[PDB]
């Protein structure tokens, strides 16, 4: 919450949070899917569909 409350554009910029550790596989899959979804969100914004 303390990091999220640093965002002055909460209604515009989405902040993703992931909790990582040295012994996991979701740490690398998260960012793979997360940026893929960001790209889809961006291109949907560009067309104005969203």
């Amino acid at each position: 919450c303390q990091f999220e409350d640093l965002n002055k554009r909460k209604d515009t910029k989405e902040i993703y949070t992931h909790f990582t550790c040295s012994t996991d596989t979701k740490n690398v899959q998260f960012v793979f899917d997360a940026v893929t979804d960001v790209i889809i969100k961006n291109n949907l914004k560009d067309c104005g569909l969203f």
Binding site: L44, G48, L49, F50
Partner: protein, 50 residues
Amino acid sequence: KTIILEQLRKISLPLYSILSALTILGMIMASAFLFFNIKNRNQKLIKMSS
């Protein structure tokens, strides 16, 4: 030489009136759909569908 008429095999007037009532009801329902779509053109759900 009994007089020979020429009558048109006419479309019934009550049937025409009933079907015109039904089609104008359908048309005003379509117009209400157009309105409730164009007024809420900003909710994302309505924005994903062009």
